[PDB]
Symmetry: D2
Amino acid sequence: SRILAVHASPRGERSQSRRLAEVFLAAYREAHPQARVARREVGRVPLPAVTEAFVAAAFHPQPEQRSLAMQADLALSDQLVGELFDSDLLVISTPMYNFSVPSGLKAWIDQIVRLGVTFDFVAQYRPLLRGKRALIVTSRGGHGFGPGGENQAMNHADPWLRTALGFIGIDEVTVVAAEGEDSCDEAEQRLLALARS
Amino acid sequence: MSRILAVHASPRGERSQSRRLAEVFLAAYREAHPQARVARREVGRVPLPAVTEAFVAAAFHPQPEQRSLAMQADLALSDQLVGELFDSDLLVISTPMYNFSVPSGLKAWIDQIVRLGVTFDFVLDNVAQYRPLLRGKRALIVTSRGGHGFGPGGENQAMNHADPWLRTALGFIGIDEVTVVAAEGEESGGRSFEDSCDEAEQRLLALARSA
Amino acid sequence: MSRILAVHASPRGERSQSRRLAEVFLAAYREAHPQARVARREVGRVPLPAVTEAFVAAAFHPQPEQRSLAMQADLALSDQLVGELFDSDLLVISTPMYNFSVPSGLKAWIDQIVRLGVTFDFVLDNVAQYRPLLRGKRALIVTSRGGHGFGPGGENQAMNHADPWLRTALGFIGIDEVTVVAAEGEESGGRSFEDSCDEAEQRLLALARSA
Amino acid sequence: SRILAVHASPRGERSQSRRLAEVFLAAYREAHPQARVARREVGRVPLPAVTEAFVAAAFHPQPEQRSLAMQADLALSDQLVGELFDSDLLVISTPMYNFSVPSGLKAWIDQIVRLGVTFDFVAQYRPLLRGKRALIVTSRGGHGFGPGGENQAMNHADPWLRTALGFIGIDEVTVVAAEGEDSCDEAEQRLLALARS
Ligand SMILES: Cc1cc2nc3c(=O)[nH]c(=O)nc-3n(C[C@H](O)[C@H](O)[C@H](O)COP(=O)(O)O)c2cc1C
Ligand SMILES: Cc1cc2nc3c(=O)[nH]c(=O)nc-3n(C[C@H](O)[C@H](O)[C@H](O)COP(=O)(O)O)c2cc1C
Ligand SMILES: Cc1cc2nc3c(=O)[nH]c(=O)nc-3n(C[C@H](O)[C@H](O)[C@H](O)COP(=O)(O)O)c2cc1C
Ligand SMILES: Cc1cc2nc3c(=O)[nH]c(=O)nc-3n(C[C@H](O)[C@H](O)[C@H](O)COP(=O)(O)O)c2cc1C
Ligand SMILES: NC(=O)N/N=C/c1ccc([N+](=O)[O-])o1
Ligand SMILES: NC(=O)N/N=C/c1ccc([N+](=O)[O-])o1
Ligand SMILES: NC(=O)N/N=C/c1ccc([N+](=O)[O-])o1
Ligand SMILES: NC(=O)N/N=C/c1ccc([N+](=O)[O-])o1
């Protein structure tokens, strides 16, 4: 059982989403002693944004012909994609920042959605990832951003992740949210339950 | 004469359609308002710093005037970015749709300019109650998308977390007069994209002539 | 009353000795010159963009006035950084020694402000002949090092590629009046570092009182 | 024979140092068909600068006690160091930018000089890398920056690299420089000779 854990909060010890995610990971490890966890930090480390060079390389009509410089432009992307390919369960921890996700997490997504690698087209688009599942652990300052919540329509954090993840083939996605920064305890207890299965 | 702040979020240069269309609007605006001020803030071709833990600590410091000089340094870019907004009457954001949202640099720009006590505030009616601090401003969002149907009524409307999300974040700080001009079909190109770009230009020219 | 530009290159905040010592100088300068302008440019706690290929293409464009708007965007930060320098009479750089040189952010700041036709130029006496374009400026470099002997006469002088290198880069654009104030022994601390910091402060106070 | 190639120019096809380095690498591969080359791009990709968090983690008095967040702060560094450990020959290509190296290369060095990993102290310092050699391939706009050159004392590019590399244990270092951007041809031919041995 291989887990990729992507932490999106820039905060360390003080991060609630990171802490909850780590509570899940620890419980998961207890119940699956053989598990491996890979951590990809995108909160405390400045992940590069997509550049024009990246666009030219990633959408190259004949990728086998990419120059060495273009391959260099894609090397981080390839590494990030590889972590995803090698994992069965993707865990993403993230704050809501301004009704969406921290910019580093947007940057991660922008690196791993890759034509001919995690999606393709025939234009109609097709996902290429299979057999993967994801758990999103998110913390929010306010309230009512969840399903049936008063502010659901303002939530462009996790519902957006579902869209992007869905596009590349990850369609089994669970969200666990703590709001009001009781809800945390319900999340933590929800996570322990999820981990022991 | 509205003072304009243009925020360009495509990493692409001459080839950016979102940038190009926004520049059509700005030039046309300039023609009708020779003395109007236009400031440009690049967030696409320039890596804009993400929000860090030090930024959070400074921005949310309970006694703001007591921030160390180091903390002030952590907010210096934010202060510059916010200042540009305060100086402007009309905000123009040019942006691609990247993976059903905006490029990460634009997200980072937003994260820098939503500032407690500066562009929004709150009181405790225990239950924090938020209030926007920007007034008298308007925004124009000029966007380009590879595919089709991300606009209202579109087959893929629910997947659109780019401009609808921008409208929400801007509304939070008090910019609720927001217009969206979108070109679609950029990936397929053809003459359907030419028409879409043509319509976008005509729309932008009308807007510029009346702003 | 010299206008001052302070460029802080340590990633550390309250704990930065190089920053602290420079702030001692600035405060003391302020006390003697209440109306003096002081601008701070953070290059340590803020990731400053490296020079890119697009920057090179724009900065070295043979017809500069013909740069596209995208190219101008590529130089916008550089223009801001250069402008700060032009506005100043005295430049104060605070910097650690990091691996026998300066932190990468400070190197990036330098790479942004050495600009053809702006802070230096050249003619072809074929064999390019360079000329600095900054005049009437002075620099003060305040530095802190973990070890000892990196100064003149020091056992490790030849390993020092921090301030001696800064002096060379600044000289290239026309700042040849450069003073270096160094504290050493920061890693060992003890009372040898206390003395070194004390001497640095006394030196900086004298400089501030006469600048 | 394992090679780590660190390219420092932000320029792609147009980069002279990159091109010369690749001429060497190709020739080296011809003569040592079993060779492996790892490429670490630090010119066209924004390598993060050392931060206060990095300092706190890297100089932690009791590293085995580092929190997960601190380990995250060091994960890139650990990866960069690992590439170095796994290599026999380090090749660095770099422009001279303002009498030194591009800032990305300074940032790389700042990630790989690591207490207890590539150097230690007993204070007296001690290198920890062994059996490695390096080749620096550098391109300069001007002239006379080499040994015995009129401008030698202004050169804080490769002579500085020697210092930093020397500090962690890489003391067999060769510099091949092209100046005046004939010298290139002499470098290229110098590189082919070096590669066939
Ligand atoms: C820059 C920033 C933006 C935020 N935006 C929102 C928001 O849009 N909606 C919300 O409910 N809370 C918002 N918050 C509050 C955080 O979501 C809340 O503190 C969350 O628990 C932080 O996650 P973390 O503990 O993992 O760092 C924001 C906080 C910060 C620092
Ligand atoms: C990294 C990347 C992600 C993209 N994601 C989407 C997308 O999610 N939906 C879509 O319709 N088009 C998408 N596109 C296509 C672009 O939106 C389209 O090419 C757009 O014109 C780019 O804006 P620009 O021309 O101003 O640079 C994407 C393009 C890139 C390079
Ligand atoms: C990444 C790093 C590299 C360093 N390299 C050197 C060095 O090469 N020589 C030296 O004497 N001290 C070195 N030091 C020690 C620092 O120069 C010293 O702690 C200095 O005070 C840092 O400056 P600051 O206090 O303003 O942050 C290094 C420290 C760090 C964190
Ligand atoms: C930002 C910048 C700084 C430079 N600084 C120097 C310098 O200090 N001394 C020098 O001789 N040439 C300098 N040059 C010229 C370059 O070193 C020369 O173009 C070199 O061949 C570029 O390397 P590359 O072809 O691998 O990109 C500089 C060039 C640039 C773009
Ligand atoms: N009910 C709400 O609108 N809650 N919003 C919380 C937010 C949004 C932005 C921030 N912020 O601190 O930046 O807090
Ligand atoms: N989803 C669509 O129908 N059209 N958009 C095309 C996309 C989506 C993602 C990307 N991408 O390049 O990452 O292109
Ligand atoms: N070289 C010395 O004698 N003292 N300096 C200490 C150093 C050198 C490099 C580092 N470092 O932390 O990377 O510390
Ligand atoms: N003989 C010289 O001083 N040569 N210097 C060349 C340089 C230094 C900086 C630049 N530059 O283009 O930035 O070129």
